[PDB]
Structure formats: structure tokens, C-alpha cells
Design brief:
Two copies of one chain form a homodimer. Chain A is mainly alpha-helical. Chain A contains 17 helices and five strands.
């Protein structure tokens, strides 16, 4: 029997994350994300939580931040690994090309309990520097690096855009990084787990994670929802669009439904609120929000009874857009990777350090039976010669 | 709650491509034994075609196929530079990964389509040659260069890599090597790539992820490990002693022996040994390694043969590569593996996405902390 999609197959144990799909609770190391955000946590604290297993003291957090900020400095050839690419490239593909360059140069990486967390921490800073430069390259802006500031989110926004971000923007970006840190074991995490299962380096693990994330069944989810709202164009048209395209089944309602949440995504609940506030000050963005909420009611009424509700990516694009990030080049998917790099590395360490096993699944053979090899010369037989071979005079 | 450790007993897909008889020691591609394939003198292109199309090509089909592959000999300057801007101490397979990653990014119009997947794969097999040529050249501080069209892919590869006309013996050996490593089971490289294309990510990303896995020492580096082992023995008269001091006492594993499937001589090793003997005999330092290798081989077989532990493909492969002219450094042999295996990878990705597409998304068992209230940082310790 084939375990299609490895669905319901346990690839590892984890301490990091758990989801209650029926109550809609997402917990990091035991802490609910709703509680984390309501308490005003820094994303750095949640990074620390993932890498160390507990929330940091003030001093620990102070030290952790220093280590992360070392990653703000990346070599020029890593930057050039981005900028030498056609500007049309997917943003996540750009991230992949840079980390692959980085994976190649990191010849002194070793899996080691003494250094794994520092390596990962600095890499989270490098991921900010990379993402900043992916964005600038896509926008035909000069290269630049993140610099230390009061928050990791602020350092990222300010360098990405080359301006001082508002407190509200910084806060929204801080929440986004926290909300996308980890979630079960999707295809990106899984691909990375497979790579490090060979004891390949952390960077290659991330590289493989990005390769899976590039696909439209994993990446592009936040962009798809926006494209859907833009397709509707006007709020008065929502029901007509909803009828012509969703109810009769011509296309899927983007940003609805989930493999685990049979209720409202806790991440979506949080993003919706932020989306309302931030978009309210940008007339063009607020319109997208109004289209989104109007569509939301039609979706819940139609699909709510079948456990199909808004997921995290229904409103996340609107939040990113309010902050200042455009739809093009799947930039939102790159923002997802900036966040998810913490979960990825945390899972890789957990795997390699405490439950290491070479990953090597099977395939069921359903091909041709054994047959003798026929040299190319005798493969296309001359019809006339063949027919004449065992022929005799017959008239 | 049971963990499928290493996914070892999990069927991740079906395949029509490859099968192994571990008791007889037979490897079959689309029903054809590699022994029979090599004895009959097939070009690797015929085997690339067998993997991508499901049958051996006619003369006409092969001719069209070669043309598409040769288009892959021209790759953009930024793919080449994705290699050459890297430190030369970089791992060869890592250089390959960075190159394919840049390519994946530039290929913005790739779409999975039953009508075009194979032409894409064919040209990519040619690009993979172009990439490996330049990975080798960069490691050796040689100028960049591209393969040129000829009747043999193996020859186009060798002539571009070394910048000289390879002998027939060298071409044949490389052609055989490409065939022998085309596909085998579903290792971490095939698997990682399968997980990536299961999101419908592009073929190039799929290759990129496969390379990510292959870079690890539990997957890559096997040919190199065996060579390092013959070199620590240094002399052939020193073999018995080295074998007692390092193997009998369990201090290190006998490299290039044993296999998860073959409980008999690896059919790839049998073919490789013959080539290694012939090709190395003409190069004194390499011949020295072959002589160590065969002498060690006898000890291994008398000691471990009864438990079904015999020489595998990586026992002699390094000697073949060295005789052709490729050095031990930077895991170049693993890059040469990737060069061959790129056919099997793409063939598996196509088989999966076209005919058995399913998003790969396994589970993790939670064994972490129970629920706890968030504590603001002011009140910690």
C-alpha cells in the first residue's frame, strides 16, 4: 500500500508546536499564540523560545539579540547571488539562490549541540538581510543591510523600505513574524528534514525547505487571496462573483479551509483585526479589506458547517500590503519564509540532535517485467527484409 | 503515535522505472539488466530516453532526443557565476546546488505539463553536464567552458571538463558510470526532491532539494570514503595489518562494502571493478590504489561474505573516476553521481506529479510542555 502524501505518517516527535484544530488553539512550547500577542511579546523572545525551549530572561534576550544581529552582515557574494538573477524571479526562489550560495561557503559547519543554537540564531538575522535584499532587488533599489534597532521587525522593515517604519507597522510585522514561525510539518519543513537526515548542513536544509515552499500548493497562498479580492474589484459585485465562481464550483475560495483547523484559524482572527486598523488609513487598501470581509460572510455561511473557515492567509496579504509590500513576485511568500526559518531550523536541530535517522522510503514496483536488451541497430526492423526472411515462392 | 523511523517501511510512491533483485544481485531499468545493457554497449542517452519515455529509443527518436539534450549545453552567465563567485574550497555538490538554484529562479515560465515535461528534463540533463563541467573547472581554477555537441554525451562532458580529447577507453568508462548511477531505490535525494515537486514546485527546485540531501555525508561522499580508506592503507603489503587494526576490532567501517538491498556482489561494482582494473593499469599511482583495493577486497569477503556483505558500487567507482582524471578533493565524485542521478530524479518527479500527484505533508508527535500561561518578561526568574 502507498502512504499517499505521507498523510497520517509520523516522521518525528516535536516539543515545539501543537495545534487543536477543533478549538482553534495554536501553541508554541505550551504558549497560545493569542496569549503571546495579547501580552505584547517581541518576535526575538519567540525565536528564543523555539531554539532554547523556554522564554528568555532579560539578559538572555539581550545576548540572544546580539547573536541575531551578527547575521545582519552577509557577504557580498551572497547578495550578488540575489542581484545577478532576472528581476522577474519569484522572491522565494531568490531566497533559495542566496542560501544555497551560503550553504556552499559554510564549509566549517558541523552539527554540534554546543553551536547549533548560535548558528541558527545568526541565520535568522541573515534571513532578514537576505529578504531585505531580495525585496530591494525586485524593486530595482540599491542593496542594503539591516542594522541593529529596538526590534528585529523594525530592523527588517526599515532596511527593506529605506525609511523609518511607524510603530503600528513595526508592531504588525512583529506579529506576522510571530504568527508564521511554525505549524505542523508541512512540505517545506519535511523537505528540509529529509535533507538534514543525511547530516547535510543547516543551510542546505533551509535550501531544500525553500524549494518545497516555492510550489503553488504551499507558497503563494496569501497572494492568491489578494488576487481573488482584486478579481472582484468592487464590493457590490461580491455575491455575483461568489455565485458565478465559488458556489457552482468553477474555482476555489482562497484563504478558506484547512487540513487541521475545522474552525477559525487563530492566526486569521488576529490578522483580521490588524488588517482592519492598518488598511483603514490607505483608501485603496481599505477597499480590499471591505471586499474581503463581505466575501468572508458568504464563505462562512456556505462552508462553515463543513468545517471550512478563514485560514491565516485570508487577511495576511492585506496586512502586508498595508505595511507597504506589493503583490508582485510572491513577496508575501518570502515574508512567510523569513518567519518560518525559525521553525525550520528548530525542527532540524531537534531531529538531528535527538532522533537522527537517515530518511530512505520505498517505492512499489509496477513497471515492465524483466526483458532482454535489444541493441539499437535491431530495434527498428526493415519491414521488407523481415517479411522476406522466411518467405517462399507461393505462385 | 508510532514514528516511522527514517520512513524505512513507508511506500512514498509507485514506480515503473527501476527494480533490484538483492539476492541475485540484479539491477533493472525498465526491465533491462544493467549487466546486459553494458555488455551490449548502449549510450547513456539511450538510458536517459528509457527513463523519460518508458522504452528504448529508435534511431530516429534518439537523434531528436540528442538535439534537445544538446540545447542544455548553453547555460546563462549567471548560472555559471553562481558557481564561480563561491569559495573554491566549497563542496562540488554544493556548487551544483547553487547553480541549479539560480536556474530555478530564472525559469519563471515552467509549468507541469504532460506535453512538455520530458523536453524540459532532456535539456536539463544537458544543463547538468554544463554545470558539472564548470563546477569541476572552478574547483581547479580553470577558465569557464561549455560542452559541445557530439555523438556522445559522455565524450562531450569529458572533453569540456578537461579541455582535451578523451580516449575511447575514458569515454566508455564515463558513459558506463553515467548509466550505472542513473537510479537506485528512493534515497534522501530522490525523496527530498519528491517532497518539493509534491507542492508542484518546478523541476529545478526539485533538483535543488535533491542536491541539498545528497550533500550530507550519510548519502554523498561514499566513493570518496573508499578512496580515503585505500590511501590510509598506503601499501598493499600493509593491508592485512590495517584490516586487523581497523576492521576486525570495529574501529571503523569497511567502506564500499555492504548494502541495504544486495546480499551479494553489487552488479554495479562487478562492472566497475573490470573498468577500474583496465583503466588504472595505465596510471602507476592509480594502479597502486587498485592493487590495495583488490587485496583488501579478499579480506572483506572472507570475513563478511557469509552475512551477505559484499563490495558495493562505491568500492571501485572512485578508481574509475581517478583513472579518467577526476581528483579526490571537494567530493567531485559525488558531483559526478549527481550528474548521472539527475536523470533518475527528474524521471521520478515526472512520474509522481503527472500520475500520482499528492501534496506530501506528514505528521509530528507532540512530546513537549503542557499548556502554560504566557509570562511577561519582567517577571521571569
Amino acid at each position: 500500500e502507498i502512504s499517499k502524501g505521507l498523510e497520517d505518517v509520523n516522521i518525528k516527535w516535536t516539543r515545539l508546536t501543537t495545534i487543536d484544530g477543533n478549538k482553534g488553539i495554536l501553541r508554541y512550547g505550551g504558549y497560545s499564540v493569542e496569549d503571546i500577542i495579547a501580552s505584547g511579546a517581541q518576535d526575538e523572545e519567540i525565536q528564543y523560545l523555539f531554539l532554547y525551549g523556554n522564554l528568555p530572561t532579560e539578559q538572555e534576550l539581550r545576548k540572544y539579540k546580539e547573536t541575531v544581529q551578527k547575521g545582519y552582515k552577509i557577504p557580498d557574494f551572497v547578495i550578488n547571488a540575489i542581484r545577478q538573477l532576472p528581476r522577474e524571479s519569484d522572491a522565494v526562489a531568490m531566497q533559495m539562490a542566496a542560501v544555497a550560495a551560503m550553504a556552499a561557503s559554510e564549509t566549517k559547519f558541523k552539527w554540534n549541540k554546543d553551536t547549533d543554537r548560535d548558528v541558527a540564531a545568526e541565520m535568522i538575522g541573515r534571513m532578514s538581510a537576505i529578504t531585505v535584499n531580495v525585496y530591494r532587488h525586485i524593486m530595482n533599489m540599491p542593496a542594503e543591510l539591516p542594522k541593529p534597532s529596538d526590534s528585529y521587525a523594525e530592523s527588517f522593515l526599515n532596511a527593506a523600505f529605506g525609511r523609518k517604519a511607524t510603530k503600528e507597522e513595526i508592531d504588525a510585522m512583529n506579529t506576522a513574524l510571530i504568527l508564521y514561525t511554525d505549524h505542523e510539518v508541512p512540505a517545506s519543513t519535511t523537505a528540509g528534514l529529509v535533507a538534514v537526515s543525511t547530516l547535510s548542513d543547516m543551510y542546505s536544509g533551509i535550501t531544500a525547505a525553500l524549494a518545497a515552499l516555492k510550489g503553488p500548493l504551499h507558497g503563494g497562498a496569501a497572494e492568491a487571496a489578494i488576487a481573488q479580492f482584486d478579481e472582484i474589484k468592487d464590493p457590490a459585485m461580491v455575491e455575483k462573483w461568489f455565485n458565478d465562481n465559488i458556489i457552482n464550483g468553477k474555482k476555489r475560495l482562497m484563504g478558506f479551509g484547512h487540513r487541521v483547523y475545522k474552525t477559525y484559524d487563530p492566526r486569521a482572527k488576529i490578522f483580521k483585526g490588524i488588517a482592519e486598523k492598518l488598511s483603514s488609513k490607505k483608501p485603496e487598501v481599505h477597499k480590499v479589506y471591505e471586499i474581503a470581509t463581505k466575501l468572508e460572510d458568504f464563505g462562512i455561511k456556505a462552508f462553515g458547517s463543513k468545517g471550512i473557515y478563514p485560514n491565516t492567509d485570508y487577511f495576511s496579504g492585506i496586512v502586508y500590503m498595508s505595511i507597504g509590500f506589493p503583490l508582485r513576485n510572491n513577496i508575501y511568500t518570502a515574508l512567510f519564509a523569513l518567519s518560518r526559518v525559525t521553525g525550520w531550523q528548530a525542527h532540524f536541530i531537534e531531529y538531528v540532535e535527538e532522533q537522527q535517522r537517515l530518511i530512505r522510503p520505498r517505492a512499489v514496483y509496477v513497471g515492465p517485467a524483466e526483458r532482454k536488451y535489444v541493441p539499437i541497430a535491431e530495434r527498428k526492423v526493415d519491414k521488407l527484409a523481415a517479411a522476406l526472411e522466411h518467405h517462399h515462392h507461393h505462385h
